Amino acid sequence: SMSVKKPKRDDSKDLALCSMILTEMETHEDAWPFLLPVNLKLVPGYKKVIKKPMDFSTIREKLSSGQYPNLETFALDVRLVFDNCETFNEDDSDIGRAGHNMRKYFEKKWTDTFK
Numbered sequence: 374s375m376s377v378k379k380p381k382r383d384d385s386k387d388l389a390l391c392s393m394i395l396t397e398m399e400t401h402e403d404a405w406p407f408l409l410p411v412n413l414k415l416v417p418g419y420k421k422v423i424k425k426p427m428d429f430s431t432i433r434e435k436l437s438s439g440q441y442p443n444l445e446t447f448a449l450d451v452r453l454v455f456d457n458c459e460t461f462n463e464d465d466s467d468i469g470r471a472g473h474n475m476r477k478y479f480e481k482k483w484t485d486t487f488k
């Protein structure tokens with residue numbers, strides 16, 4: 374509360390570390406469904422069903438332009454990519470399995486890096 378501060382976790386390397394994690398996700402062989410925005414003009418249903426589209430290139434642009442106020446807002450967008458994927462794809466489909474794999478990949482990097 375006012376004039377009562379909790380000890381400050383060092384966040385000086387957060388930007389660099391999130392960038393490294395994102396690079397690792399960008400270069401994963403199962404990242405191909407998530408590299409660019411889904412084409413809303415070519416994929417029936419996507420625009421109406423998925424209220425907040427998100428993809429790696431969009432996360433990269435936001436990270437590079439100071440649009441994440443902290444590391445948790447970055448993690449929220451990454452998870453949104455995989456949440457959208459689960460909403461729109463069957464678990465037993467190529468894209469569906471890719472999403473599950475990528476989420477697992479991300480969360481271990483996240484824990485190992487920050488927890």
Ligand SMILES: Oc1ccnc2ccccc12
Pocket residue numbers: 406407411416457458461462468
């Ligand atoms: O859910 C998806 C993620 C990435 N690409 C997609 C392409 C077509 C239909 C769904 C997709």
